[PDB]
Structures are given as structure tokens and as C-alpha cells.
Amino acid sequence: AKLVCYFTNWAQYRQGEARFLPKDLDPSLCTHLIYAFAGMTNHQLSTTEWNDETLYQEFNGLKKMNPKLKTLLAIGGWNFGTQKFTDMVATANNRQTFVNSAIRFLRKYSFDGLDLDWEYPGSQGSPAVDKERFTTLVQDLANAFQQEAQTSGKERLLLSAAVPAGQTYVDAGYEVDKIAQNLDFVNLMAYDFHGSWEKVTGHNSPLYKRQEESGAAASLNVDAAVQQWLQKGTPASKLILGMPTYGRSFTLASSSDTRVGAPATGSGTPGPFTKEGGMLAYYEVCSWKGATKQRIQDQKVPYIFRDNQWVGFDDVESFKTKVSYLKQKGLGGAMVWALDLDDFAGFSCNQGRYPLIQTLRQELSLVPR
Ligand SMILES: CC(=O)N[C@@H]1[C@@H](O)[C@H](O[C@@H]2O[C@H](CO)[C@@H](O)[C@H](O)[C@H]2NC(C)=O)[C@@H](CO)O[C@H]1O
């Protein structure tokens, strides 16, 4: 089993106990640690924060403490957009520039692989031609990593990708059967199914549909997303089930209607540390005072409300349920977005350090013995 965990290079800017620093990294928590994010400059892999090189040293330095650990560098992410990917994959020349730069960069900074986080080929401004061009990029990288291993004698660089759960994005961008052959593993972003972009409450990451749902909505759940990727050709062993250590929040139209599917007027109030309306870290919801926690019976996940605020999130129990699910489906492991949104320092939830991610590790039978 794998436990793939994302580090984010902006968590260092949060205030107080929420500030995530190198000391908070645990070398034996996860099997694979992925650094979010690198960017691109003139079609070449590049850093995005002023101190990334310092953090790379710390991050990859964890392997001294745990030599089994593998690290990857993720390129892209939501905020990065699509244009630079589009321009880079447009020509064989630009792809070659990128691929060669990636190999040199990963070797220079001691990463074990690259995680592709283009959000997304064929959508968010990216043209339809990018679906096949993404397939080619994945192939170019896989083949070049294979060649570098042969020439250098070093262990081959890993290639993974973070991929969307919704059919609209999947079909616009991803030749699933083709790319799955060339990726070492596939990080399924089984979250952000619902959020304050909608005008009714819905859960960030429900396991199953609700009985009331129909149409496309009935596929906006973890089980449907997993089945989608499997049926379209991803080997179960390569599919890694993403898990969110955050929730998505709403302002309710009325404090008297707190159901799933109740009218909402917009994003929930920003959290005191994360300061982003519409999301909350686990450590910002786990210890809500004077609130009412509820479970969505069909969907196997909790929500919580207080006055006109409503949040769908994941807890220890829902993580257990989801690991039982992934094991039943024979998947390759779990992925987590993100280290810094769990109660990494044990300051809030009275559950010790990393209560959610330690649950994944335990349920996957990955505890260091
Ligand atoms: C691997 C992965 O899930 N990548 C995406 C993430 O970028 C995204 O997290 C969001 O990243 C933005 C930067 O690109 C941040 O500004 C933003 O705050 C952050 N949002 C959260 C909840 O962490 C995650 C999560 O939505 O999913 C992908 O879209």
C-alpha cells in the first residue's frame, strides 16, 4: 500500500499554531511525499516560492531519517492555470525542453519523481487539442525517465499525476487507458465534489450518492469517481484514492434549514487561520464550540453547523470508512490533500498530531514496526 501526502509551500505563511514549518514534517508518516508546487518558466521546470530551494533540502533530507521514503515534485495546481502547459505541449520542441529540464531539476534537488497537476488539459481555457497532447507529454516523460535510468544507472524517476473526479473534466482531457500505462500511479482528487460555487449545501467528499440525487449529480461521489477511473482503464493497483483533510463551507439562507441540499447564499465565513471563504482545515472544524455535528447516512461522511454556517468535512470515522472501501476495491493506497490541513501539531482537536493522516496509515497497515 501507498500513503501519498502533499506538502504545500504556502502553509509556511499561516499565522500562529497553523504555521507549517520543516520541523512539522514527519519522515515516516507517509510512503510518498509530494511537494506542491513547482511552476514553469520558458517551458522549463522552476520554483514558485523564494525559499523553495531551502525547503527542498529539508524535504528531501527526510530520506536520511527514513531511506524508504520517496519524494516527488508536483507541477501546476489550480492557481497555476493552463496557458503555460498549453504552450509547452504545443510542439515537440517545447515538450523536449520541458522533459530535459525536469530530469535535470529533479536530479539536482534530489527528488525521486514528478507529479503532474495540470488543472486541466481540455478545460479551464485549455483547448481540445490538449487531450492528446497531454497523452503525448505523459508518454514523453515516461520514456525519457526510462532512458535516463538506463544511461545513468540510477533508479528510474517516478511519474504520477493528480487527476479529476468529475466526468466533464475527465472526458475533456484524459485518455485514461493510455496515460495509465505510462504513469507509475494516479492520484485521484476525490474531493471538491461540492462547495460554495453551488447554491445548495453539499459535501466536499461523499463516499456514495444520496437517494434523492439523479443525473450527473449521482456521479459526484468517491465511489463513482473510483469506478469511473477503473472502468476507463486504470489498473486498480495504480489508482490512489485522494482524501481531504479539509472541508467546504457554506452560509445558509436560513439557520432553520441545515439539511444537505439546503439553500445557501454563498461561502462560509473564512477560518481564523486558513482565511479562505468556502474552505476550512480539519483543525478549524474539529473543535467548533456550540455546533451540531451530523452524519449524512447515505454518504458516510459528517457535516457540522452553527447558526447560519454549514460545513461538510471528513473525520477519523469517514477516513476509516474510505480506507475500508479502497481495500475492498483493491486500490493502490490513499493520497491526502494536505499535510498542513490535518491537525499536524495537535493544537486543536485533542487527538494528537496528524489524527487524520495517522488514521490512514493505521488502516492501511503502514505503521512503522
Ligand atoms: C493535488 C491537488 O489536489 N491539487 C489542487 C490543489 O491546487 C487544491 O488546493 C488548492 O490549491 C490552490 C493553489 O493552487 C490554493 O490556493 C488553495 O487554497 C488550495 N485549496 C485547498 C482546499 O487546499 C486542492 C484542493 O482544492 O485540489 C486541487 O485542485
Curated annotation (Swiss-Prot):
One of its GO terms (molecular function) is chitinase activity. Changing residue 53 to K: Rare variant detected in patients with Gaucher disease type 1. Residues 1-366 form the GH18 domain. Its EC number is 3.2.1.14. Very high plasma levels of CHIT1 are found in patients with Gaucher disease type 1 (GD I). Can be used as diagnostic aid and to evaluate the success of treatment that brings levels back to normal. The lineage of its organism: Eukaryota, Metazoa, Chordata, Craniata, Vertebrata. Detected in spleen. Secreted by cultured macrophages. It comes from Homo sapiens (Human). Keywords: Carbohydrate metabolism, Chitin degradation, Chitin-binding, Disulfide bond, Glycoprotein, Glycosidase, Hydrolase, Lysosome, Polysaccharide degradation, Secreted, Signal. GO terms for cellular component: extracellular region; extracellular space; lysosome; specific granule lumen; tertiary granule lumen. This is Chitotriosidase-1.
